[PDB]
Amino acid sequence: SPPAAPRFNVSLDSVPELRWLPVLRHYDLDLVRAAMAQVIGDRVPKWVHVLIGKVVLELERFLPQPFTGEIRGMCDFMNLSLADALLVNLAYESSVFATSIVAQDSRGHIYHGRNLDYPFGNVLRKLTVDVQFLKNGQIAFTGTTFIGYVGLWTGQSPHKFTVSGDERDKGWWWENAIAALFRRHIPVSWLIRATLSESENFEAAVGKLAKTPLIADVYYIVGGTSPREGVVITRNRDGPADIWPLDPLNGAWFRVETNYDHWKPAPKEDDRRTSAIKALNATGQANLSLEALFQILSVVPVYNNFTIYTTVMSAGSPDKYMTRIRNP
Ligand SMILES: *[C@@H]1O[C@H](CO)[C@@H](O[C@@H]2O[C@H](CO)[C@@H](O)[C@H](O)[C@H]2NC(C)=O)[C@H](O)[C@H]1NC(C)=O
Ligand SMILES: *[C@@H]1O[C@H](CO)[C@@H](O)[C@H](O)[C@H]1NC(C)=O
Ligand SMILES: [Cl-]
Ligand SMILES: [Cl-]
Ligand SMILES: [Cl-]
Ligand SMILES: [Cl-]
Ligand SMILES: [Cl-]
Question: In 3D, which of 65, 101, 57 has the Cα closest to residue 82?
Fold first, then answer.
């Protein structure tokens, strides 16, 4: 059976530059550096590496807190350049594949599950962690991430909402991202974390995730705590291209999103959407549970050779947030 991801706490009462240090000390930084060094060489184009290396300090002015400070803190503790630490944190914003599911059972309770896939040789499975971010000793929100990565592709605000992000690949990622960063747009995984931290309820989270300027396109899957509180937000950098909510009155008790626009067919080369829908159809609304979602997310090719982890969560039952490493 897949093992649960290591769980750690991160205190938001500590300043950004030191928050992650207690967590980093549990890891072999030789492994982390080797992994970060590999990603730069593998995922960052040469012209980007040259450019950011020279202008990182000018770019830092336009980046938001506390993300820069947390990256700066990981710079010093690992003897890595600020440019390289920033680049790795941007490299994982793209080339990440996913399946996200938000669904409503017969009682109107909301369930949320997702797979995250990375199609390159990696040590992400060894660096995946569930993190509880604390304010005054209390859990403000929970997220799943990789050691050294300050954004959240997956997270939960207890008794409020759950969020997962799927990449929306429209090409020219680095060209548009750099220009967007200098215009104070933010990474898609950083917006998820900022939403988990700030938004007071599901409705407010959907608004913030739908409208905040981004450096790239993305799909945001959001689940709430009341019946019908589930939505797929298809984003472009400036705003929402499409808002796709649960619609039980019309028989739509789930929404599936992989990495493609739902109003178009999934590509024949990569049709994880069809498999997920059939498994949900076979499971049935009456049998929907977090465990049932985990089983759906274990069906090939929804579950595939590149799957890093599987997360199931329900904001109404925050204690059930569970991330399991796949293919370990
Ligand atoms: C991670 O943070 C949680 C939340 O603050 C910690 O749980 C608290 O632990 C103290 C001491 O055991 C208790 O007095 C609190 O009531 C606990 N609260 C909850 C909700 O569990 C947890 O101990 C922290 N983990 C570690 C390893 O320190
Ligand atoms: C799912 O079920 C609905 C209703 O039963 C059906 O119309 C649809 O074709 C099914 N889709 C798949 C992929 O099984
Ligand atoms: Cl923000
Ligand atoms: Cl935060
Ligand atoms: Cl309903
Ligand atoms: Cl899709
Ligand atoms: Cl459940």
Answer: 57
